Amino acid sequence: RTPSDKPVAHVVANPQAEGQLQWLNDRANALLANGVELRDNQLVVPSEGLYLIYSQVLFKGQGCPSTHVLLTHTISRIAVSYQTKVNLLSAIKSPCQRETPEGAEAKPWYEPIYLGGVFQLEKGDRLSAEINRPDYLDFAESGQVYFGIIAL
Amino acid sequence: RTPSDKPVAHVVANPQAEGQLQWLNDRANALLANGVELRDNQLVVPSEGLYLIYSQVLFKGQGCPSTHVLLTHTISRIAVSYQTKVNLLSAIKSPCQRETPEGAEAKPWYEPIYLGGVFQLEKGDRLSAEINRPDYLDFAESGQVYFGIIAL
Amino acid sequence: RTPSDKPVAHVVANPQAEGQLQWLNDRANALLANGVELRDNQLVVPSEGLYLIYSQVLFKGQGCPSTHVLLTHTISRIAVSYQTKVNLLSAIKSPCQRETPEGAEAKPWYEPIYLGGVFQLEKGDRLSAEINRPDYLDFAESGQVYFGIIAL
C-alpha cells in the first residue's frame, strides 16, 4: 500500500464556492486517508489517538472600511458524547486601523492566521475549521487556505 | 484512555494571572503525558529526540501608543548539558506603523504570533516560552495562548 | 548523534547571499538526516510517505515606500510524476496599510510568516520554499528563516 495506516487528512478550501469555506479533499495535494472522512464539512476522527490539528485561511480586502473588521479563524471540536462545539485553537486579527481610505482608493491588505496544536480526540469526534468572514477569504491559491489532522 | 505514547505536552496559559504568562495543566485538552513535566513554568523534556515544538501568543491592544510597540514571542532552549540558553524560535511584530489614537479614543488591534519548528532535544533539556510586553495579553482565552511539544 | 529511522531535514538561510534565499545544512540546527538531500537549493526527497513540511521567513523594513509591498511565501512541490512546480502552501502578508509614513522615516515594521502541512511525497520529489522579496528578508536572527521536512 502507500498512504501508511496513520489516519491522515489535508483538506483545501474550494475556490469555486463563495462566501463559504468548503473543504475539498479531491484536488491534487490533498489527503483523506485511513479512517478520516469529510462529512458535514467537518473531519470525523476514525480512532482514539493524539492528533496535530493545524489549519490556515488567508484573508483579503480592498481598502479599510468603517466598522472595525475583526477577523477570526477557529478550530472547534464536537465530541461524541458532549456534542457541542468546544473551542480547540483560535485567533483574531484586526487588519484595519486607518482613517478608512480616501485620496486614493483600494490598496488591499492580506491577512493569514495559522492554528496548530496536539489534542486528544476519541472515535467519532468531529472537527471543523471555520471563520467569521467567508466574504474576505481569498483563493487563486493552491495552498492558501487549508485544514488538516494527522494521527501521532 | 490515553493511546499513542511519545513525550507529549500541549499547555495552555492561565488566564487570571495579570500579565505574567504562566502555563497550566488540567484545563481545556491540555496534555502532559509520557513524562514531560512542566516544571518551573517550563516543559521539561524526557529523553532525546526530534521534538515538534510549537506555541502561540495573542497580543491585544486597545489603541496605539506613541512609543512604538514591538512584540516578540520566543521559545528558547536551556540545555540540561551546557545549561546555556539558546534561542530556538523567535518572531517580532509591530501592531501599528504609528498612528497613536489622538482623538476618538480607541480601536483595538489584535496581533497573534505562532512559532513552530522541528528540533533536536536532549533528556533533561528545558524549553521556555516568553514574550516581552505581557501587559498586552488577551484574557478572552478560550484556547488562544498555548505552547506544546511531542516526540516525532 | 541524531535520532529516528525516518529521513528529515531543516536547512537555514545564509546571511550572506545578497538578495536571495540560500538554504544551508551546517548552521543553527540545520539537519540533513537519513537520505534527504538539500540540492539545487531544494530538498530532494529520499522516499515515499507522509512528510511534515514547515518553514518560516521574517521580513523587515522601516517606513512604507511605494504604497504596496506584498511579501509572499510559498513552498512548492515539483513531483517526479507531474514535473512542474506546484504550490503546496502559500501566504501573502502586506505591511503598511497604505501608510507611507513620510515623517516617521526609518520607523521599522517586522513581519514573519510561518506555515506547514502534511503531504504524501514520493521519491526524487523536489521542494522549493521561496520568497518574493529577499531584499525584505531579516537576517539579524538565528531561528528566523528556516524550512524543513520530517518523515512521519
From Swiss-Prot, chains A, B, C:
Q: What is the effect of changing residue 79 to V?
A: Biologically inactive
The residues covered by the THD domain are 7-152
Q: What is the effect of changing residue 86 to A/D?
A: Biologically inactive
Segments in the Extracellular topological domain:
1-152
The intrachain disulfides are 64-96
What is the annotated localization of this protein?
Answer: Secreted
The entry's protein name is Tumor necrosis factor, soluble form
| Span covered, complete protein | 82 to 233 of 233
